[PDB]
Structure formats: C-alpha cells, structure tokens
C-alpha cells in the first residue's frame, strides 16, 4: 500500500556498496531528495519484507532514519530520508574525523542511544547495531538505520551466524551461539559501537579474525581502553560486554549517561590530539 513505482525513483550518485546491497542518493519525484537502498535478488523474501515493513512503518523517532516507501518486487528498493554525511563509519574515517573530539563523539553516541531507547521502549530489536548502519546528517546529527532487516536475511551462512558476511565482532555471545537476539544483545553491539567512535572507525578486536573472536570473548577477553579515552567510558563499554545479558545496562541509562557525561562523569576533561 505504501508501495511506489520504480520509474518514480532516479538514482543519481552511489554512496556505498555492501554485502547484501548498495545505497544511492536520489530523487523520489524530482522534488524529494531520498536515500535508496537496493538489495540483491535472493537476499530476502518480498512477502517477509512487506510484513516486516509494516513494523518498520510503526517505528517513528527523530533519531531513527524514517521509511518513505518501498518496492516489493526484486530487486527490492527501500526509500528513506536522505542523510547528507553518509555512514558513520564513512564520517569517522573521513576528513572531518580529525576535528572530532570526545564531546562530539559522546554526543553522537548519545543520539544513537536515544533512538535505541525508543526501540527499547517499543519492544523491538535492531539485531545489527554498528557504525556501518548509523547515518550522519548535517550538524552532527546521527540516526539509527536498517533496523529489522537482519532477521529477514536468507543467506545460509548468515543464518548460522557464520561466514564473515556476519558481524560476529559486534555480536553478543548468547546471540552468536544460540541466536537469541534481544534489546540486551543490541546493548552489546552498542558497546562495540562505542569503540568505533573513540577510535574514529577502527575495526573491533584489531589483529584478531572472525573465527578467533568468539572463543576469546567466551574466555573473558574484552577490548582494552582506547588511547586518550577516559577509563570511565571504557568501563561503560565493559558493562555492555557483561556475559550475563541481564546485568548489561539499558539504552535509557546509556542515553542519560552519555548526555550527562561531562557534568556528571568527567567534568575535569581536557581535549587531546585525538580525543
């Protein structure tokens, strides 16, 4: 019903290409600038996507990238609000990243937490929360994107949480072994997302490989405090990385913590070369 015609969409410039798809800046009717994400055929069933898209329509928040329209027929097109600065991973690794400091990054972290807090309130699970799926816009605005599409993926390796098409490094152990995805498992991913911010886009568990990570995490290995990062922020990461999901923090707590970080947690902060 929210379906639209393909001819309505013009794909102008390719922002990115991914494992299951690519993303384009475009025009929706010659009037509306939009982001168009396209999935390769055989990624997910169109009925399943439409069923899920109903839920995606339900989810509305200012820190969530808002769905505009879809094309059910393969290749499936997802049409959403355009974000000017592209991916968070793109932004951090970009020229602007050098000018980013801890207050900016914590603020960016806070916005993500605010969107997830809404998702937490809505009893929903993202299943793949990381910098790649964060979108940045003008004035350092960060919004969470691509929620709910992880479940719909039909890839055989991906289903078993295996095969390097899977973001195992961001994935909580209980959700990796047994595939139990909760808002709590998202909190684990968020802690990993915090690493991406404070390292300005470095891949998690550097030097380790996807096979290596799960056993290391299982035996209690956790990522060390990043350079120029306050131990207090790193402690927050560790809370997110607790083995028992129940003792991991809520997104509501996270949002307030990040928002009040420089008055309540680190009032005596001084900027460094990186942070």
């Amino acid at each position: 019903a929210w379906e639209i015609p393909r001819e309505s969409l013009r794909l102008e410039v390719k922002l990115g290409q991914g494992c299951f798809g690519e993303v384009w800046m475009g025009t929706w009717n010659g009037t509306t600038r939009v982001a168009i994400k396209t999935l390769k055929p055989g990624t997910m069933s169109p009925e399943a996507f439409l069923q899920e898209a109903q839920v995606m329509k339900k989810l509305r928040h200012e820190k969530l990238v808002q769905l505009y329209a879809v094309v059910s027929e393969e290749p499936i097109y997802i049409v959403t609000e355009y974000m000017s600065k592209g991916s968070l991973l793109d932004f951090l690794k970009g020229e602007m990243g050098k000018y980013l400091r801890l207050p900016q990054l914590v603020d960016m972290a806070a916005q993500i937490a605010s969107g997830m807090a809404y998702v937490e309130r809505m009893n929903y699970v993202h299943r793949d929360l990381r910098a790649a799926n964060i979108l940045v816009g003008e004035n350092l605005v960060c919004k969470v994107a691509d929620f709910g599409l992880a479940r719909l993926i039909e890839d055989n390796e991906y289903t078993a949480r295996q095969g390097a098409k899977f973001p195992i490094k961001w994935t909580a152990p209980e959700a990796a072994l047994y595939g139990r995805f909760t808002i709590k498992s998202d909190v684990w991913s968020f802690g990993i997302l915090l690493t991406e911010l404070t390292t300005k886009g470095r891949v998690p568990y550097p030097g380790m490989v996807n096979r290596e990570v799960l056993d290391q995490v299982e035996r209690g290995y956790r990522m060390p405090c990043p350079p120029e990062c306050p131990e207090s922020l790193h402690d927050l990461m560790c809370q997110c990385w607790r083995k028992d999901p129940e003792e991991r923090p809520t997104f509501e707590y996270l949002q307030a913590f990040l928002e009040d970080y420089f008055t309540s947690t680190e009032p005596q902060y001084q900027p460094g070369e990186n942070l």
Binding site: L15, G18, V23, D128, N133, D146
Partner: peptide
C-alpha cells in the same frame, strides 16, 4: 549491509 549497504555501506563489507
């Protein structure tokens, strides 16, 4: 997913 879209941005490997």
């Amino acid at each position: 997913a879209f941005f490997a």
